[PDB]
Amino acid sequence: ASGMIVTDAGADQPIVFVNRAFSTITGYAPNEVLGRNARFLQGPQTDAATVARLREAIAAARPIQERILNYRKDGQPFWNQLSISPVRDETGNVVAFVGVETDVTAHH
Amino acid sequence: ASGMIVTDAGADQPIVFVNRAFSTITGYAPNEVLGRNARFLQGPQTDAATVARLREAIAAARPIQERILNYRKDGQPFWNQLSISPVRDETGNVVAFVGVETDVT
Ligand SMILES: Cc1cc2nc3c(=O)[nH]c(=O)nc-3n(C[C@H](O)[C@H](O)[C@H](O)COP(=O)(O)O)c2cc1C
Ligand SMILES: Cc1cc2nc3c(=O)[nH]c(=O)nc-3n(C[C@H](O)[C@H](O)[C@H](O)COP(=O)(O)O)c2cc1C
Numbered sequence: 001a002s003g004m005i006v007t008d009a010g011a012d013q014p015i016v017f018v019n020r021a022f023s024t025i026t027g028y029a030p031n032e033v034l035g036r037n038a039r040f041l042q043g044p045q046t047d048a049a050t051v052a053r054l055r056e057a058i059a060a061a062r063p064i065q066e067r068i069l070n071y072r073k074d075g076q077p078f079w080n081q082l083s084i085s086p087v088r089d090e091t092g093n094v095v096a097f098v099g100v101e102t103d104v105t106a107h108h
Numbered sequence: 109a110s111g112m113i114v115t116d117a118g119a120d121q122p123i124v125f126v127n128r129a130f131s132t133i134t135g136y137a138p139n140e141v142l143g144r145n146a147r148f149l150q151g152p153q154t155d156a157a158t159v160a161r162l163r164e165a166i167a168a169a170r171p172i173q174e175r176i177l178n179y180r181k182d183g184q185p186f187w188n189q190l191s192i193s194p195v196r197d198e199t200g201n202v203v204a205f206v207g208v209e210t211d212v213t
Contacts (some may be wrong), residue, residue, distance in 0.1 A: 016125065081197075087208060090173065090210060095208055096206075097129070098206060100197050100198075
């Protein structure tokens with residue numbers, strides 16, 4: 001099952017909702033992530049160029065897909081097939097961002 | 109500001125998240141709507157053909173926009189400029205639906 005993250009549109013995109021699969025994939029409970037920017041999923045082996053592409057796309061409210069190395073709450077790495085899109089009203093205003101996370105690590 | 113509703117993909121698309129503007133527009137608190145299908149916003153003068161187009165779009169996970177008559181908690185009618193889209197993973201599985209509601213009364 002794929003995770004879903006919903007964030008606020010503005011001011012560093014704090015998480016406002018995660019689905020159950022997000023907790024299965026990442027090991028974080030909703031309590032532990034609400035109000036935070038999702039960058040806490042990254043760590044030392046995360047590719048900086050990938051993070052830069054995400055940062056520029058989100059600032060521009062442009063959809064983006066990347067494979068990015070992320071980390072579970074207890075530090076276990078996983079590859080995240082990540083897709084982020086703005087949610088817009090019909091006037092084009094960004095209401096939120098939605099991200100889908102698929103664990104594409106062969107853990108076992 | 110526009111409302112946002114997030115639902116599960118299956119089992120009659122129960123609401124799992126609403127933003128602040130949803131409550132400003134509709135007069136419902138989150139605890140009054142979570143776990144329910146959004147159709148409770150409809151009422152006596154809602155256009156049945158519009159509802160049927162939404163039903164078919166959600167069944168097929170097709171993006172759709174409609175101007176639909178809805179009702180606030182206090183029973184006052186309002187025009188909802190509603191846009192719904194599926195949220196998909198890379199393999200095309202539907203993870204959720206997202207709806208944006210603009211009060212265009
Ligand atoms: C809706 C949404 C979901 C996100 N999900 C993830 C994720 O699962 N993993 C991740 O590494 N970054 C994720 N991000 C990206 C980070 O929040 C952040 O935008 C990125 O690290 C680039 O900005 P920075 O260089 O300021 O950290 C997400 C962002 C948004 C808006
Ligand atoms: C994410 C989402 C948001 C929705 N928001 C609204 C809404 O604001 N107003 C409304 O009348 N129907 C809304 N609906 C539509 C109803 O939930 C339902 O799909 C529609 O009435 C057609 O199905 P039915 O014939 O089974 O009721 C929404 C549906 C989804 C999936």
